[PDB]
Amino acid sequence: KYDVVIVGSGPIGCTYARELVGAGYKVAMFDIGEIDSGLKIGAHKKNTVEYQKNIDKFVNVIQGQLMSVSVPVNTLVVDTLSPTSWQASTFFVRNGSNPEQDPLRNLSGQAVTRVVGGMSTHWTCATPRFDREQRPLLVKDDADADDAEWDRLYTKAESYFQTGTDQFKESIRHNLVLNKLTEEYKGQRDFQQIPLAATRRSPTFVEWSSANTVFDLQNRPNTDAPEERFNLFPAVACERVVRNALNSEIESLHIHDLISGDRFEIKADVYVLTAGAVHNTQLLVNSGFGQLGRPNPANPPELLPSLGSYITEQSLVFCQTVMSTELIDSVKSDMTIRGTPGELTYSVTYTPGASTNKHPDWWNEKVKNHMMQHQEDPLPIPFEDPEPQVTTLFQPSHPWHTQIHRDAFSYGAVQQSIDSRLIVDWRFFGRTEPKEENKLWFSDKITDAYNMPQPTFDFRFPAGRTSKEAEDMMTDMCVMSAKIGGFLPGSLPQFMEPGLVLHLGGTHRMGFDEKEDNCCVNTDSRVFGFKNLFLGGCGNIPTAYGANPTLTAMSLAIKSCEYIKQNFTPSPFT
Amino acid sequence: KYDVVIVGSGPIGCTYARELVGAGYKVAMFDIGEIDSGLKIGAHKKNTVEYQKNIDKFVNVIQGQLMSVSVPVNTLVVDTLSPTSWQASTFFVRNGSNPEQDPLRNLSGQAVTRVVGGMSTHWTCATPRFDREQRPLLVKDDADADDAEWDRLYTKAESYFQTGTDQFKESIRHNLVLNKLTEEYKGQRDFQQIPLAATRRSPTFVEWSSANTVFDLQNRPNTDAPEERFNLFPAVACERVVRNALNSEIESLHIHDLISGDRFEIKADVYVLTAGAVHNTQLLVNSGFGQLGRPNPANPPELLPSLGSYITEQSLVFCQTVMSTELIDSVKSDMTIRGTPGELTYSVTYTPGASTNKHPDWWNEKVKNHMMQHQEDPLPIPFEDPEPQVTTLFQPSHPWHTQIHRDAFSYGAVQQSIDSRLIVDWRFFGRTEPKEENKLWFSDKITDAYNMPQPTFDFRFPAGRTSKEAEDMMTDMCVMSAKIGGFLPGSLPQFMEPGLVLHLGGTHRMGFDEKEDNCCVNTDSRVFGFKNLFLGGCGNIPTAYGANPTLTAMSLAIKSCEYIKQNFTPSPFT
Amino acid sequence: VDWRFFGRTEPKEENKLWFSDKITDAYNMPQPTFDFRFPAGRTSKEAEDMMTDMCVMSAKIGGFLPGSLPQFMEPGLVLHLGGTHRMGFDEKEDNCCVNTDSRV
Amino acid sequence: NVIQGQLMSVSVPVNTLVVDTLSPTSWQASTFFVRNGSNPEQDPLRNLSGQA
Ligand SMILES: Cc1cc2nc3c(=O)[nH]c(=O)nc-3n(C[C@H](O)[C@H](O)[C@H](O)COP(=O)(O)OP(=O)(O)OC[C@H]3O[C@@H](n4cnc5c(N)ncnc54)[C@H](O)[C@@H]3O)c2cc1C
C-alpha cells in the first residue's frame, strides 16, 4: 500500500516522482525494464568517456534499445533456398510480426525503449518551448494568463532538465554555421543554439541530462533524504488498472513480476501512468477504457471514446552536408601562412585584437594551434572541436522545427571516407494535424512479447496543410542546407520512415471538455470521470507541433502534480 | 599503497581479484572503462528480460562496444560531392585512422571493449577445454603430470565461470540437430553441448556468466566480507609501469584519471596486467619492454625481444542454414493429426511411451501443445524453444573447433523473411601456427584515442598447415551443414574479416625459457627478469588453438595466483 | 519523372586529357588519363545553384522517389566532354587546335 | 542494360578496395597492383570516372 504509484521511470514519471516524493508522499514506481546505465540509476548512456570519444558507436546502442511497435507481416520473396530447406507456402506470421497491420498505413519507424530511465537513457536532449501556435491551451479566453502559466511551467521544467543554451558557445563549427545562417537570413529568420538539457563538464565532455537528472531514482529514506519515501521496482510489467463499479475511481494496479513470475495487485491513493504514448494507451485499453480490437464506429466505447484517436506524428526530413570550401577557407581567414607544412619554417600566425580580423582571438588561437601542431592535416578545424548545435525555431512563415547539428540517432552514422569535421546533419520536423481517423488501436487476438494486446497503427499524413507544409519543409531544407555545403553522398535529402522520429502525440489527448475537445484527460492530466487516475507524457499533447515534445510533456506533468498536492494528503511517515 | 594492483576488470583480472582478495591481500583494480551494466558490476548485459525476449537486438549492443584496433587510412573514392563542398586532394588521415597500417596485412576485425567487465559483458560464454595438441605445456617431460595440472586448473576455472553442459538439454532444436549429427557421424565424430558459462533460471531465462560471476567487484570491506580489502577505480587509464635501474622490479604504475584529468603514480608490491591481448602489450611497450615503432630486426630490443611477435588469430568460417523439410517433418513424426487446422475437428495426439516413437515424451508433449495452441502456425517447433548449442570438439582428424548454435555476435542477425526457428548458425574456428613475422607493434608517432601508442598489425595466416586446414575447415562446414539444411541466402559460407573472431593470442606469450621458447612470461605468468610483474589473458597462450581461449587464460591466471600467494604476503589489515 | 540539370564548365588550361607513354588500352593505343576538377568560382557556384534549382522546381510536380534522391552524378557520366581539340581563330591567342573550318 | 553494355570506361584508377576475406589458400595480393585494365597514371581524385 502506497500513497502514489507511478508506472514508468522515464523523464515524465521522474517528474511526478520528484514533485511528489519531495512533498512527502509515499511513492512506488514500477518499470518493465531494468537498471542498465551504471550506478547513477536511469542516467544517460552517452555519459561515458568512451562514448564521447567514439560517438558514432552510440548509434549502435540506440538501435539496440528501440524495439519496433508494429511490424507488418513480411512478404519478401526468398526463392533461393535450397530445395531441401523447409520453404513456406504462405506469408504466415513469423518473428513477432503483427497480422492486423496494414503495411501502407503504418508508423513503421515507431519503437519503444524498455529500460529504467526510458528513452531519456539515449535521447538527444533538445528541449525547446512551443510557441502559441503549437501549444495546447491551459487557460481559455485569456492569452496573457495562458502565456504566464506556460512560462511558469516551462521555467520549472527547464530547471529539472538543466536546459541551457551556452554549452556550445566555444565550438568553431557551431559558430561557423550559426554566423553564416544568421547573415544569410538577416531580417527574415533568427538562429540560436538548440536549447539542450545538458551540463558541460570540460572542453571535451558534456554531461547529458536524463531521467536521473530529474530524480535520482535512489530508494528512500536514505542518508541524503531521511524523511522521503520512494521505492523503484524494475522488471515489473504493469498490466492493468482496475476500475470500480461506478467508473469513478481506480481500485488497484495489476502487476506481473517478471523475475519471479508472480502476479499481484498494488493499492494506492493515486495512480499515475507514464509508460510512454504507446504503452499508456495499451494499459488503459487492457483496463476497459476505449475499445479493444479493430475500431468499429457502429459500437463506440463506453469510456474515453477518443482514446487512441487523433494521433499525431511529425514528418521528418533529413540530410547531411559537406562543408563548403568557402566556409572552410573562412575559418582561417585571419591567418597568414608561410612556408610549406612539415618544413622548418612553416608558420601560421594572426594579429590578436586586429580590428580587421573576422574572428575573435579565442577562435584564432585554436585554429593557429591546430594548424601548427597537426601540419599533416589539411583542415583548419581542431580535432576535438565540439559539434554544431544550431536551430531556427518554428514560426508561421516556416512552420517546422529545425536542427542543424551533429548527434547520435538510430540512423545517420558518419562514415569514414569524409572527414567528420566537415559533416553537418539537417533534421526538419513538421507538425501534423490531429485527425480522428488517425488511430493507435490494440488487437483483441494478437499479443506482444509481454502477452499484452498488440499495438496496431492506422495512420497517414493528412492531406491539406500537413502535406503541403511537409513538402515545403523539404524544399526549405534543400535551400538552406546549400548555404553551408552540398549534400553528402549516401545522406541525400529524404523523408524518414514514418515514426522513426519518435515524437508521437495525442494518443490520450488533453482538453477542457471530454466531448467538445475530443479528449481523454483534462488540464490537470486527470482522466475524465476518475478521481485518482492521471496520465503523463507526449500522449497528452493534443495540438499539431513540430518542436521536440518532452519539455512540454514535463510542463504538463508539473501542473498535474500541483493538482495532486491540492487533492490528496500524504500518509504519516512511520 | 596496495599489496596488489590489477589493470583491467575483465574476467581474467577478476580471477586475480577473486584469488587474492579471498586470501586477504589489499587489492586495487583500475579500469579505463566505466560501470555501465546494472547494479551487478561487470555482469552480462544480455541478462535482462528485454534482451532475452529480443535477442537480435543484442547484436547492436555488441557493435556499440567493439572499438576497432587499427583502421587503415580510407581510400574510397567519393567523386559525387558538390563542386562547392570541400574536397580532399589526398587520402589524408581522417576519423581516427592509422597511417602505419598496411590494409593488406591487418586484423581489420580486431576490436576492444572498454567497460567494467570487459568483453565478458557481452560474450557468448563458450568455455571448452583445450586438448593436448592445442595446449601449452605446464610440466616438461611428464605428460601425466601435465594432464593432472591442467585438469586441476580447468576444474577450478569451470567453477569460477559456472560452466555446465546441461542448460539446453530440453531444447527441441538442440536435440534435433544433435541427434542428426550424431547419427550421421556415428563412429567418426562425437557431438555434445557446447560447455557454457551459464546458469538456467527458468525455461526461458538464462543467467549468462561474466566477470561479475567470477568476482562481484564490490568495494570491500563490506557486510558480506568484513575482513577483505578491494577497491575498483573505473575511468582510469593505466599508462605504464616503471622499471627499476637493473630491470629486476617494477617500482610503480602511472595512471591517468579520466574524470579529473590528473595523473598519479600508484605503488604496490605486485603489479598484474589484465588489459587484454592488445592493451597489455601496449602498456608494456609504453613502459620500455620490447620496442616502440616499426620493427627493425637490425636493432633488437634489450628487454622481452619476443613481445608482440608470434601473434596468433584464428581463421573463422561462418554460415547460417534453414532447417531441412525432412528434419521439420521429423519433429512431428510421432503425431497423429486428424482434421484441418483451425476447425473444431482438428486433433493432434501421440501415444506416450510407444516403441515406435522417434522422440521422447517431453518432446512430443511440447509439440502437441504447440500444434493445438497455435493452429495458424505451420511449424511444429514451440515458440519459446531454447536455442541449439551443439559442438564436435577439435580432434587430430578435424583440427578446428565447431559451434552449431544460435547466439548474438556483432554480425549474423536474423532478419524477417525466414522464421527464426528454422535458422542455425555454423561457426568453425581454425588454429594458427605462431610465426615470428606475425606482429603487433606500436607507433612511435601515431597515438590512439587515449594518447597511447597506436597499435598496428603485420599479419597474414601462415602458409602451410594453417592455410590448408583453414580451407579444409570451410569444406567441412559446407559438408556438415548440408546434413541439417541448405544455406540461408544472405549468410552463405564465408571467411570472416580477420580478427573479428576476437581470439587473439601470443602477444606476450608464455614458455619455460625466454630465449629457447621465444617468450615473455614463464608458467607462473611472471615477466622474465622481474620479481613482481605478471600478465594475465589470451596473450599468454603460445600454441596454435582453435577452441575459445578464455577458460584456458583463466586457468593460467589461477596458476599465477598460486605463485603470488607463495611469494608475497598481505599487509596487516589496518 | 526524371530531372536532369546540366551545368556549364569554364575552360581552364589545367584541366587536361593526356595519354600515357607506357600504359596502353585494350587496342594497344596510349592510355587516356584525366586531370580534372570543376573550376572553383562560377562553375562551382552555378553547379550548386543548379542543384538547388532542381530541388525547388521538382517539388512543384511531386516529391523525390526514394532511391533516386537529388545527387550529383559521377563526373563524366553525362558524356558531354568538349574542348579536347578546341576551335578558335588563332592558334596562339585563342589557345586552340583547329580553325573555324575545323582545319588543324 | 543495352547502354551499359556499350559504354567502356575511359580511365579506371587502380583499385584499392580491401578484400580481406579470401580463403587463406587463395592467392592474395601484397600490393594494389595493376589489374583488369586499370590505369596506374590516374589520380582517382582528379578523374572523369564516368567518362566512357
Ligand atoms: C534517438 C532518440 C532521440 C531523441 N531526442 C529527443 C530530443 O532531443 N528531445 C525530445 O524532446 N525528445 C527526444 N526523444 C524522445 C524522448 O526520449 C521521449 O519523448 C521521452 O523520453 C518520453 O518520456 P516518457 O517518460 O513519457 O516515456 P519513456 O522515456 O518512453 O519512458 C516510458 C517508460 O515506461 C516503461 N513502461 C512501458 N510500458 C510499461 C509497462 N506496461 N509497465 C511498466 N513500465 C512500462 C518503459 O520501460 C519506459 O522506461 C528522443 C528519443 C530517442 C530514442
Ligand SMILES: Cc1cc2nc3c(=O)[nH]c(=O)nc-3n(C[C@H](O)[C@H](O)[C@H](O)COP(=O)(O)OP(=O)(O)OC[C@H]3O[C@@H](n4cnc5c(N)ncnc54)[C@H](O)[C@@H]3O)c2cc1C
Ligand atoms: C561477441 C563476442 C563473443 C565472444 N564469445 C566468447 C566465447 O564464447 N568464449 C570465449 O572464450 N571468448 C569469447 N569472447 C572473448 C572473451 O570475451 C575474451 O577472451 C575475454 O573477455 C578476455 O578477458 P580479459 O579479462 O583478458 O580481457 P577483456 O575482457 O578484454 O578485459 C580487459 C579490460 O581491461 C581494460 N583496459 C584496457 N586497457 C586498459 C588500460 N590501459 N588501463 C586500464 N584498463 C584497461 C578494459 O576496459 C577491459 O575491461 C567473446 C567476445 C565477444 C566480443
